[PDB]
């Protein structure tokens, strides 16, 4: 059986998985139960010497997405979404869920000093677990190309458990509990990965969707000071769909609103100390109360009930202002998107069919946007179906007269155009950006949000050369071109720089393009980012 040593020298036993070695379910924090609910994680101090870690531990409590894909999608599109496992609750789950897992090449010794790819799963900040989105394919490919890496994944609290907000949470300084979980795991890696054969100074953090936004957050965490024990917690970052979270502070309007609902539904409305009452709830009651707020696939959609919010200390301010003001770590980065990020989410408002309904929907989703700003917005994103997402599909995929429009808007604000704003202001290091169109032609969704997960962890596709090969090269040499791809990946400086600045993917292979599309939408959304925060 494979073995490894921890920071204090304790020895643990792993699992020989034939194609790789795994150390699963390692506790990195005291169970965030009872009194510790909503609070940052406390490091685990009990000795693990002589123990075995051959199985995943449970995921953190999961919030039902409240969506319905197998009711609106045709077979081929549905099959791919299911294969990606995106937005699917992970079982079993429990509040005692803060474990970390390590996957390494077989025969890896403590002296290997391999680069470490620290993965942050994405599940809309309301569900998900480290057990899904397997790193096996990444590791196998790193070995095949002679640039072996160690894959690390951690669970972090989601929904109310990890992102409860409101005035009480803020006054206590407990905003963004789930992000703290991720932060502690990163510190855990700094202190323990060497004993598994990894090099703590070669950590590349990466994530998809909520995990990509989390990765970005880690760049601006504590205003860009990512040092721990005197050393950077990571040397690079990869963002697969998402960066800045367009959100108001912890004690803002919607955070307080969602909090009041949880408190009321849990039977704590008459408590003199609301937080203490919530902390004294059975696991089931807190779960039920949480189930009484909207899930990610429900009508409010990307107006998430739970998501990272500026707290003033760890995420000190409006995340868009953080990047403009340079409060970030200086590391090279890769950040890309799937051509049609918003299709999955647009499926949550198929009852919005008229221009008037669309306007009403945007107004309720963006409580800070004036009528004038909404006008400009609806002029940038028209009802002309040929201009919506799936992009460049003409009259096709218009399941409703507004689906392609709403999809385009939501995908751009949450992912694609937000990325351009990040790239335009970020000067922390060399930047590389990609835009996938690998699934062009796929009815209804197109190259949808999360499809990269399939080609990164389950199947080999044209995009795999990027999600695997290029990413591994980046984690190894801080340059995706060391992957030896037959198409050079140009560096990105600004959305108006000369020539092609995006590595792109089609059904067969690679090519490059320009990040110059939908400019009026970019200006309509970001002339004042806060007007479109949730």
Ligand X SMILES: *[C@@H]1O[C@H](CO)[C@@H](O[C@@H]2O[C@H](CO)[C@@H](O)[C@H](O)[C@H]2NC(C)=O)[C@H](O)[C@H]1NC(C)=O
Q: How many residues in the shown chain lie near ligand X by CB under 6 A?
A: 7
Among the listed ranges 3-11, 295-303, 393-401, 447-455, the one in contact with ligand X (CB under 6 A) is 295-303
265 contributes a contact to ligand X by CB under 6 A: no
Residues 6+ apart with CB under 8 A from 184: 28, 29, 40, 41, 43, 98
Among the listed ranges 8-16, 37-45, 84-92, 294-302, the one in contact with ligand X (CB under 6 A) is 294-302
Residues 6+ apart with CB under 8 A from 9: none
Pairwise CA distance, residues 531 & 518, whole Å: 19
Catalytic choice (174, 209, 389, 407): 209
Pairwise CA distance, residues 299 & 461, whole Å: 33
Q: How far is the CB of 371 from ligand X (least distance, A)?
A: 18
Q: Three-class SS of residue 436? A: strand
Q: What's the DSSP call for residue 465?
A: I
Q: How far is the CB of 299 from ligand X (least distance, A)?
A: 3
- According to CB under 6 A, which one of 335, 352, 369, 435 is a site residue for ligand X? 352
Among the listed ranges 80-88, 92-100, 293-301, 400-408, the one in contact with ligand X (CB under 6 A) is 293-301
Helical (H) or strand (E) element with 372: helix 371-380
351 contributes a contact to ligand X by CB under 6 A: yes
Q: How far is the CB of 256 from ligand X (least distance, A)?
A: 17
Give the Cβ contact number of residue 34 at 10 Å. Answer: 11
Residue 341 catalytic? yes
| Among 332, 347, 336, CA closest to 456 | 336
Q: How far is the CB of 318 from ligand X (least distance, A)?
A: 26
Name the residue nearer to ligand X (CB basis): 323 or 352. 352
Residues 300-329 within binding reach of ligand X (CB under 6 A): 300
Q: Three-class SS of residue 303? A: coil
Name the residue nearer to ligand X (CB basis): 102 or 369. 369
Task: Output b/e per residue, 453-485; b: 16+ Cβ within 10 A.
Answer: bbbbbbeebebbbbbbbbbbbbbbebebbbbeb
Among the listed ranges 165-173, 209-217, 351-359, 365-373, the one in contact with ligand X (CB under 6 A) is 351-359
- According to CB under 6 A, which one of 27, 41, 249, 294 is a site residue for ligand X? 294
CB 258 within 8 A of CB 165: yes
- According to CB under 6 A, which one of 357, 440, 500, 506 is a site residue for ligand X? 357
298 contributes a contact to ligand X by CB under 6 A: yes
Residue 151 catalytic? no
CB 317 within 8 A of CB 533: no
Catalytic choice (180, 449, 464, 495): 449
Q: Which residues are catalytic?
A: 209, 341, 449
Footprint of ligand X on this chain (CB under 6 A)?
294, 298-300, 351-352, 357
């Amino acid at each position: 059986a494979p073995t490894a040593t921890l920071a204090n020298g304790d020895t643990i036993t792993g699992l020989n998985a034939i194609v790789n070695e795994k150390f699963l379910g390692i506790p990195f924090a005291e169970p965030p139960v009872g009194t510790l609910r909503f609070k940052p994680p406390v490091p685990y101090s009990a000795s693990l010497n002589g123990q075995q870690f051959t199985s995943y531990g449970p995921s953190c409590m999961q919030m039902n997405p409240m969506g319905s894909f197998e009711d609106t999608l045709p077979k081929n599109a549905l099959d791919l979404v299911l294969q990606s496992k995106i937005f699917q609750v992970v079982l079993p789950n429990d509040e005692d869920c803060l474990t970390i897992n390590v996957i390494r090449p077989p025969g890896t010794r403590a002296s290997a000093g391999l680069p470490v790819m620290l993965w942050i799963f994405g599940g809309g900040f309301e569900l998900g677990g480290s057990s899904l989105f397997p790193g096996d394919q990444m590791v196998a490919k790193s070995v095949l190309m002679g640039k072996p890496v160690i894959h690390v994944s951690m669970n972090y609290r989601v929904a109310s458990w990890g992102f409860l907000a409101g005035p009480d949470i803020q006054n206590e300084g407990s905003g963004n509990a789930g992000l703290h979980d991720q932060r502690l795991a990163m510190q855990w890696v700094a202190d323990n990965i060497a004993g598994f054969g990894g090099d703590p100074s070669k950590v590349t953090i990466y994530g998809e969707s909520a995990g990509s936004m989390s990765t970005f957050v880690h760049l601006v965490w504590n205003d860009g000071d990512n040092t721990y024990n005197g050393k950077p917690l990571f040397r690079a970052a990869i963002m697969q769909s998402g960066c800045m979270v367009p959100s108001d502070p912890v004690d803002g309007t919607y955070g307080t609103e969602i909090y009041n609902q949880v408190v009321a539904s849990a039977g704590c409305g008459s408590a003199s100390d609301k937080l203490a009452c919530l902390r004294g709830l059975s696991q089931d009651t807190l779960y039920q109360a949480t189930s009484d707020t909207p899930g990610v696939l429900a009508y409010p959609s990307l107006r998430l009930s739970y998501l990272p919010r500026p707290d003033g200390t760890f995420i000190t301010d409006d995340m868009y202002a953080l990047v403009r003001d340079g409060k970030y770590a200086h590391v090279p980065v890769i950040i890309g998107d799937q051509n049609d990020e918003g299709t999955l989410f647009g499926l949550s408002s198929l009852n919005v069919t008229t221009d008037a309904q669309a306007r009403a929907y945007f107004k309720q989703s963006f409580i800070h946007a004036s009528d004038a700003e909404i006008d400009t917005l609806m002029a940038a994103y028209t009802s002309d179906i040929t201009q919506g997402s799936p992009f460049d599909t003409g009259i096709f995929n218009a399941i409703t007269p507004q689906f392609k429009r709403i999809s385009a808007l939501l995908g751009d604000l949450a992912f694609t155009l937000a990325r351009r704003y990040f790239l335009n202001y970020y000067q922390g290091g060399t930047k590389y950006s990609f835009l996938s169109k690998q699934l062009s032609g796929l009815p209804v969704l197109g190259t949808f949000h999360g499809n990269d997960i399939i080609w990164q962890d389950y199947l080999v596709g044209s995009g795999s050369v990027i999600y695997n090969n290029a990413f591994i090269a980046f984690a190894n040499d801080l340059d995706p071109n060391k992957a030896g791809l037959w198409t050079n990946w140009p560096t990105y400086t600004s959305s108006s720089q000369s020539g092609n600045n995006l590595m792109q993917i089609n059904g067969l292979g690679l090519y490059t393009g320009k990040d110059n599309f939908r400019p009026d939408a970019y200006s309509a959304l970001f002339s004042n980012p806060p007007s479109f925060f949730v």
